[PDB]
Scaffold this active site. Structure first.
Site, mmCIF file in Angstrom:
data_model
loop_
_atom_site.group_PDB
_atom_site.id
_atom_site.type_symbol
_atom_site.label_atom_id
_atom_site.label_comp_id
_atom_site.label_asym_id
_atom_site.label_seq_id
_atom_site.Cartn_x
_atom_site.Cartn_y
_atom_site.Cartn_z
ATOM 1 C CB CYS A 275 18.387 3.169 25.848
ATOM 2 S SG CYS A 275 18.688 4.674 26.799
ATOM 3 C CB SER A 276 17.851 0.779 29.935
ATOM 4 O OG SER A 276 18.932 1.666 30.207
ATOM 5 C CB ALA A 277 17.568 5.054 32.483
ATOM 6 N N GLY A 278 16.488 5.835 29.273
ATOM 7 C CA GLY A 278 16.176 6.896 28.309
ATOM 8 C C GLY A 278 17.031 8.183 28.433
ATOM 9 C CB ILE A 279 19.234 9.720 30.516
ATOM 10 C CG1 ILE A 279 19.962 8.690 31.412
ATOM 11 C CG2 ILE A 279 17.841 10.062 31.050
ATOM 12 C CD1 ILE A 279 20.019 9.022 32.988
ATOM 13 C CD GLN B 4 23.818 9.047 32.483
ATOM 14 O OE1 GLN B 4 24.229 8.420 33.469
ATOM 15 N NE2 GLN B 4 23.277 10.249 32.579
#
Ligand SMILES: Cc1nc2c(-c3ccc4nn(Cc5cn[nH]c5)cc4c3Cl)c[nH]c2cc1CN1CCNCC1
Length: 506
Positions: free
Chosen positions: A437-441, A484
């Site tokens: 994704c964006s931060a990968g979490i 998250q």
């Protein structure tokens, strides 16, 4: 330990705790009792309490006038070992965690639970050293520790195992087992007797090895479990999982090197050293050529994954080096390139029909195929100068995930993951599926956990045990903060429920 998080406190209760029981440098974190994904860091400085907002929409914890983090434990660890400033720019020191005594987010705390309810669970689900703490019923305000001890080898109730109940008195908000030390909380008591177990007069050691597991369910029981957690129960279950994130503070030294700083989308969201993807065969002239913000995720209890961030302009070549080296043949992208006007992943693939070189790697976009929820790009990846290295990489770009929160219906994610699964399965010896994704979490963790859980059920059918929090914790041990928000946690359950329901309609 994560004792500084207080799950059931108001802002005014937090101010009064810090002013009566804290000093300057004391701090605590707490959720908003309404807006979920809102948290507050409350800190005492110069005899007064400041409150700092921490927002999580699904991608990371965003601390106001600070940085972005994968977990609140990593946020606290960063500031307790380094930086945090108010709006006028003054430094706020996090020195002294203000510990919470509330047992509600401990895995072993089962609240109302009757004594017969507790014996049945320990008998059916429990093992030697399995324990729980429940409220007494006979002596209100007191508690009971129930522990199973025995020989696990037998497959019969032959008296080789037993449950023992230990009364816990609460006298002036200190806790005791009838003698010895008096503890400030049930957690302190359990931790004490976990290291120094009670021994019965005739020798039995009441070993507190593991909390009783109540989250492992048969996949067929999913709908009932969702119904029980909706009466929320999802919040308690999620916050119990979040309380264990202090056990996952593994080192991230490679991501912290000066040479590697600008290869991170977010400076403090970093891959664990022990599961990071190591890039080999780098340019000998590049001093540190082995780093990408990516981790191998290997389900542990056949498919593995690489969880990574959205490319930066200066990591696109690294990304393709990773894909080539690992023999990955499927990429899952779960963000648009731009959301809310901000870049979440640079375009790292060519336009349809075009060929580009990304350092030593050459990529052709052979064809794009648009579906409602996603675009598929058929890419051909090869090493420049070696035409016999070409392989197809299928890029599945999920385009409809909302900017904040989660999809209201899991059908599109499930149809997408089913397609990705069959693609991967059709390619002999394919390497890990890349998910970013964006931060990968956040989204990345959600998609990977769904895929894992759905893969159990696809191979075993509806009669398999699944355990959502246990699976998340296993994945969070391989990359920081995977899954998250409580919204994503519920969405995982809803996706598993929908998948089961459509397997029973067929
Ligand atoms: C028992 C329980 N367990 C959980 C977990 C949970 C499950 C299983 C785990 N296994 N591990 C280790 C590991 C290693 N590899 N993978 C997992 C940690 C796990 C957690 Cl935290 C998350 N929420 C939970 C709620 C409860 C029960 N609640 C009742 C109400 N009061 C709060 C308690």
């Amino acid at each position: 330990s994560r004792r500084w998080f207080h799950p059931n406190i108001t802002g005014v209760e937090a101010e009064n705790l810090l002013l009566t029981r804290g000093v300057d440098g004391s701090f605590l974190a707490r959720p908003s009792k309404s807006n979920p994904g809102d948290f507050t860091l409350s800190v005492r400085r110069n005899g007064a309490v400041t409150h700092i907002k921490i927002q999580n929409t699904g991608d990371y914890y965003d601390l106001y006038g600070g940085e972005k983090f994968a977990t609140l434990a990593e946020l606290v660890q960063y500031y307790m070992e380094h930086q945090l400033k108010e709006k006028n720019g003054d430094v706020i020191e996090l020195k002294y965690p203000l510990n919470c005594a509330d047992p509600t987010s401990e895995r072993w705390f089962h609240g109302h639970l009757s004594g017969k309810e507790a014996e049945k669970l320990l008998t059916e689900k429990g093992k030697h050293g399995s324990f729980l703490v429940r409220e007494s019923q006979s002596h209100p305000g007191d508690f009971v520790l129930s522990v199973r001890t025995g020989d696990d080898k037998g497959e019969s109730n032959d008296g080789k195992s037993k449950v023992t109940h230990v009364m816990i008195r609460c006298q002036e908000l200190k806790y005791d087992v009838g003698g010895g030390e008096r503890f400030d909380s049930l957690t302190d008591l359990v931790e004490h007797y976990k290291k120094n177990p009670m021994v019965e007069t005739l020798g039995t050691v009441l070993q507190l090895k593991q909390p009783l597991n109540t989250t492992r369910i048969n996949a067929a029981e999913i709908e009932s479990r969702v119904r029980e957690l909706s009466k929320q129960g999802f919040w308690e279950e999620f916050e119990t999982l979040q309380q264990q994130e202090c056990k996952l503070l593994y080192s991230r030294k490679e991501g912290q090197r000066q040479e590697n700083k600008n290869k991170n989308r977010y400076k403090n969201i970093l891959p664990f050293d022990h599961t990071r993807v190591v890039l080999h065969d780098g340019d000998p002239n590049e001093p540190v050529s082995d780093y990408i913000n990516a981790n191998i995720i290997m389900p542990e209890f056949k498919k593995s994954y690489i969880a990574t961030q959205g490319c930066l302009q200066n990591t696109v070549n690294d990304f393709w080096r990773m894909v080539f080296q690992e023999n990955s043949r499927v990429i899952v992208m779960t963000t648009k390139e731009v959301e809310r006007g901000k870049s979440k992943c640079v375009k790292y693939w060519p336009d349809e029909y075009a060929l580009k070189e990304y350092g030593v790697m050459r990529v052709r976009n052979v064809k794009e195929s648009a579906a409602h929820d996603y675009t598929l790009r058929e890419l051909k990846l090869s090493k420049v100068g070696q035409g016999n290295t070409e392989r197809t990489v299928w890029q599945y770009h999920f385009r409809t995930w909302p900017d904040h929160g989660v999809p209201s219906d899991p059908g599109g994610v499930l149809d997408f993951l089913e397609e990705v699964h069959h693609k991967q399965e059709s390619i002999m010896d394919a390497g890990p599926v890349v998910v970013h994704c964006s931060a990968g979490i956040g989204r990345t963790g959600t998609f990977i956990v769904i895929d894992i859980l759905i893969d159990i059920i696809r191979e075993k059918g509806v009669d398999c045990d699944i355990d959502v929090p246990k699976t998340i914790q296993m994945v969070r041990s391989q990359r920081s903060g995977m899954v998250q928000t409580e919204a994503q946690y519920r969405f995982i359950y809803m996706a598993v429920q929908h998948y089961i329901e459509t397997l029973q309609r067929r």
